[PDB]
Ligand binder design. Structure first.
Ligand SMILES: [Cl-]
Ligand SMILES: [Cl-]
Ligand SMILES: [Cl-]
Ligand SMILES: [Cl-]
Ligand code: NA
Ligand code: NA
Ligand code: NA
Ligand code: NA
Ligand code: NA
Ligand code: NA
Ligand code: NA
Ligand code: NA
Length: 129
């Protein structure tokens, strides 16, 4: 599923991401935008052999099982395929664990390089939430 901007903001809010660990909803939408352009089905292979899945490009190195990432963990206790669903629940629940891991949203390199310090509120501007 490719979400609309406000559509995704609303879903993220309904699943408790808005201000989760102090990160406003706009931070989350911005991260999703640059990670997957709002496409739940987005996958990308990493140089280390791991793969990133879903709207927030969650990495199989630590967070999900895809069966083909040697020496990895599955800390979210889910198949990486669950992260591609039109229903964002699994992505959100896993992202909450990731953002709690110590480095906050810096876990998402794209959030650090493209969202951090910017006017993230622009990402939810105009949305009925
Ligand atoms: Cl957009
Ligand atoms: Cl915001
Ligand atoms: Cl594996
Ligand atoms: Cl933090
Ligand atoms: Na689509
Ligand atoms: Na914070
Ligand atoms: Na993609
Ligand atoms: Na894909
Ligand atoms: Na992989
Ligand atoms: Na994801
Ligand atoms: Na997703
Ligand atoms: Na695994």
């Amino acid at each position: 599923k490719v979400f609309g901007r406000c559509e995704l903001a609303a879903a993220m809010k309904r699943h408790g991401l808005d201000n989760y660990r102090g990160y406003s909803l706009g931070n989350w939408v911005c991260a999703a935008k640059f990670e997957s352009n709002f496409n739940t089905q987005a996958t990308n292979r990493n140089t280390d052999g791991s793969t990133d899945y879903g709207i927030l490009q969650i990495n199989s190195r630590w967070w999900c099982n895809d069966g083909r990432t040697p020496g990895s963990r599955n800390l979210c206790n889910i198949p990486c395929s669950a992260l591609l669903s039109s229903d964002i629940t699994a992505s959100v629940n896993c992202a909450k664990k990731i953002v709690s891991d110590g480095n906050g949203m810096n876990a998402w390199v794209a959030w650090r390089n493209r969202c951090k310090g910017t006017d993230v509120q622009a990402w939810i501007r105009g949305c009925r939430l």
